[PDB]
Design a protein around this ligand. Structure first.
Ligand code: IHP
Ligand code: IHP
Ligand code: ZN
Ligand code: ZN
Lengths: 335, 191, 191, 335
């Protein structure tokens, strides 16, 4: 299996672009940044709000917890290659405590509200806008030969006041090399694609599109998480009860994969459930027919049959967002 | 009931400033990065910590046996340093501070403000452990010999400062009055 | 040789901060003003310090003899307070400071600066004895239990401060280094 | 025995003038004065240089060591009665430490050089001047019914730069009440008069004149102390070897006094030695015939035969000093 788009990005580009294990670690001055307070309590790295001592401009400080040196270089190299990109978090500097060499990544200041607190207050338009802004980030990183592999609400930071969206924490991101078999222990349980659950190791950028689909379903249907598995096996069972098992068997037969008999017994046999089943009076205002068609084209077992980020941006669901972006740049060119 | 290495260790004279690092945190082989190298005896020192019967623990002489204990001690110390920083260990340390297990400031003008344990550097064998009084905001030496010898890196220059903003309410206001250098009721006239 | 009450007392655990007040100072009945009153068992305490055979020290029971020792201690402490202030006593204390008999500062940034003994007030039974570090210029509590209980008035808020302008050369310069609140190598935000 | 002059001063003046034991102790604010450094190490009181926190004017702080409450009141009452007097040290305030009530007397700032260091550099004129200035202080305090009783070099402070002399430390001073018998344990050994050494307790102001004579002899002959006794008995022996024993016996017979046989044995028998005996090439410039006549009229066994301070000021020895002071008055009156 090879990606439908951006397949040879890392074959075309030189070894220095994707060879993160040989990256030179040019540290900056840890004295230049002063900590203010904790923010995120993730166990891979701790997050703090800080300031540049000179410019006094705020910033985010992400202190990395002891992992393999190559994992640190992977995140830094990816952040460097994507730096500046649309809606990608901007890495400003990489410093370490001068005696213990404890590394810290310096980013632009976020000032966001977490997805869980904010989404219950969003209109259908705001959902389309933010999904569109997220797709801009996904198309960019995919075009640069990189898969995020940890798409989830916590990793999408939104400052609703300023309508700014940033895709953060590239700790699990990886370079796409055509035909390469990757580790399946990526993404958060609820957002893991079928490829991870059935051991299809030569997955691609399309994995992020499944995770985006899971987030989208959780938003428009107001059910967080949409696929609520208690473990990795149950996660596939939850998916099979919605998408159906006939489509799962066709997908397994297409890629010559077979499930362990214990897992196949758990999945059982189920019909495909239409997305209309999940609509209720409390989520109706967020579920338009275009929303359903868009979601249906993301949540497919076959990774090669899912929309690309570019194809997703072109969907009729975002016609209003694209028209508003075109009207904004016309009224801003006059003012 | 036989007290596991973790629970027993904390009760030794001077070595009480150590919280019980959860078994769930030691069995989490991800936090063990770096330690897997710089600390010798690694498997036999971790087997002793989890109290599992070693496959070659029987086969050691008096000479090897004593050293495994000292390696497990250095290990658990550096383990403690990373645990007290996590949101889980932060909670566990708070409780010992509530019951003033980390003593009280030797400076009289700090009333009787309890202190936080901290090592001069996050670097092993380089320094003994010291304390930090949040009221005066300075650092001092321990009150007992049994405490004043232990390596400080088993806490690091990160925990007392993290405890500060984690619990903003506990940060006390500065000294109410100031020291009066008086000789016979008359202040020292300094120009 | 028979160790007189003065010489013997100084060797007790925690009570070593006391210089041998000369007999030439106790037999000088002029310094004994005030003490002649406020001091319990006044004569029996003074017979005890000079080790003179008391005319009734025979008939004194377990309950009576015990109180004479407690009266002679309090008395000798207040005696010590006035002796250390005289030009004679000042010299004798200097020697104990030379051989660091008055410990060293618990503040780490004091580079191992020895301290001077001082009571919170020149008033008896009101306060325990504390120390003064000349480098930081602040006051602290003692390091041992045996020292941290003794009444401080036996030194007074006059002696360590007298020691300051008596020996100007001993006054050390302030701390070169200061405490840096670093969390992972990053200075704490003090706006 | 009664004084030749100022006999009835304390009989004439009211009980409140001399009744120091009933003095009200009105303490000032100890906070108003800040200590600077030690100066004198006397064992009755310790001396320090200080400053008034308000005026910032320098001052002397004399901290009194635990003595009978009446002794404190005696010095204060005497200082109050003599305050302002010519060449008398000026008491400015009396304060105590608010918790231990340790008393301290506040005086005007001295800034003097001690007598021992200074006198080897003095000319004969400077000696006459300072002796004259000291006599002004003695006549004043005697006129006020007070005996200093501790006249000695240490208690005479001279700032040679400003030509200022002050008589300090009135701790041993006492009121003269005609006929009264006083304690003989006063004055420093070398300056004790014969009356103290032979137990004539009803002594008077003339005791100070003996002490002044001892100081004068030590100055002009460059021998400090002039009468160098190793103890109180030897002190009388040293005096008897100069003044003679025949004059001592006449004095003892006049006042019906008799020495203890052991003391009379020590004294033995000696002729009167003329003051010329003590002259040498090193002190010649300080010993004029007027100096000898003046000294001879001070160092007499019979206290009633010694010059009064007023009589001493009128001696021919001070003729140049009086002419310089009378010329200064004319010049100061016009300018
Ligand atoms: O890539 P390596 O140089 O082989 O080292 C890493 C890891 O260290 P890093 O985090 O620095 O990459 C371990 O090294 P230590 O923590 O023990 O120093 C090492 O352990 P062993 O020495 O026991 O082999 C482990 O080796 P292995 O590949 O055998 O598991 C290996 O893992 P990775 O190659 O997967 O990074
Ligand atoms: O209260 P005290 O500490 O016992 O003081 C007194 C008191 O001195 P003060 O009035 O100055 O405080 C008396 O002094 P004088 O009137 O004799 O000068 C005299 O009282 P007693 O006759 O009751 O003993 C005695 O001093 P001294 O022995 O010199 O006469 C002395 O009492 P102490 O002998 O107990 O110290
Ligand atoms: Zn403090
Ligand atoms: Zn200090």
């Amino acid at each position: 299996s090879k990606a439908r788009v951006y397949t040879e990005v890392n074959v075309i580009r030189p070894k220095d672009y994707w060879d993160y294990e040989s990256l030179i670690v040019q540290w900056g001055e840890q004295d230049d940044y002063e900590v203010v307070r904790k923010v995120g309590r993730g166990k891979y790295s701790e997050v703090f709000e800080g300031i540049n001592v000179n410019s006094k401009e705020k910033c985010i400080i992400k202190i990395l917890k002891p992992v393999k040196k190559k994992k640190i270089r992977r995140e830094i190299k990816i952040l460097q290659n994507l730096c500046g990109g649309p809606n990608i978090v901007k890495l400003l500097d990489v410093v370490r405590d001068q005696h213990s060499k404890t590394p810290s990544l310096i980013f632009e200041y976020v000032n966001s509200t977490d997805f869980k607190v904010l989404y219950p207050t969003l209109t259908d338009y705001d959902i389309r806008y933010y999904i569109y802004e997220l797709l801009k980030a996904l198309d960019f990183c995919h075009s640069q030969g990189i898969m995020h592999r940890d798409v989830k609400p916590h990793n999408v930071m939104i400052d609703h006041e300023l309508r700014k969206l940033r895709l953060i924490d590239w700790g699990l991101a990886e370079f796409y090399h055509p035909g390469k078999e990757y580790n399946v222990r990526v993404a958060s349980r609820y957002f893991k694609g079928p490829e991870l659950l059935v051991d299809l190791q030569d997955y691609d950028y399309s994995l992020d599109m499944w995770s985006l689909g899971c987030m989208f379903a959780g938003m428009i249907f107001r059910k967080e998480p949409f696929f609520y598995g208690h473990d990795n096996q149950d996660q596939l069972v939850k998916i099979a009860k919605v998408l159906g098992t006939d489509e799962l068997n066709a997908y397994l037969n297409k890629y010559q994969l077979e499930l362990d008999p214990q897992l196949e017994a758990l999945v059982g046999r189920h019909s495909r459930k239409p997305w209309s089943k999940f609509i209720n009076a409390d989520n109706q205002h967020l579920v338009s027919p275009e929303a359903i068609d868009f979601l249906d084209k993301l949540l497919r077992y076959d990774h090669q049959d899912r929309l690309t980020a570019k194809e997703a941006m072109a969907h009729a669901y975002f016609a209003q967002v694209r028209a508003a972006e075109t009207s904004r740049m016309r009224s801003q060119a006059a003012a | 009931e036989d007290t596991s290495w973790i629970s027993w260790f904390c009760n030794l004279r001077g070595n009480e400033f150590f919280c019980e690092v959860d078994d769930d945190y030691i069995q989490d082989d991800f936090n063990l990065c770096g330690l897997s190298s710089l600390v010798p005896y690694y498997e036999y020192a971790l087997d002793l910590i989890l109290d599992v019967e070693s496959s070659q623990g029987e086969m050691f002489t008096e000479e090897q046996n004593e050293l495994i204990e000292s390696a497990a001690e250095m290990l658990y110390g550096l383990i403690h340093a990373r645990y007290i920083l996590t949101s889980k260990g932060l909670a566990a340390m708070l409780d010992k501070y509530k019951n003033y297990d980390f003593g009280r400031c030797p400076r009289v003008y700090c009333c009787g403000q309890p202190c936080l344990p901290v090592g001069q550097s996050d670097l092993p064998r380089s320094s003994t452990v010291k304390i930090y009084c949040p009221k005066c905001e300075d650092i001092y030496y321990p009150r007992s010999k049994y405490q004043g010898n232990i390596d400080g890196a088993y806490f690091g220059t990160t925990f007392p400062h993290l405890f500060l903003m984690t619990y903003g309410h506990l940060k006390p206001a500065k000294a109410t009055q100031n020291y009066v250098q008086r000789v016979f009721g008359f202040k020292l006239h300094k120009p």
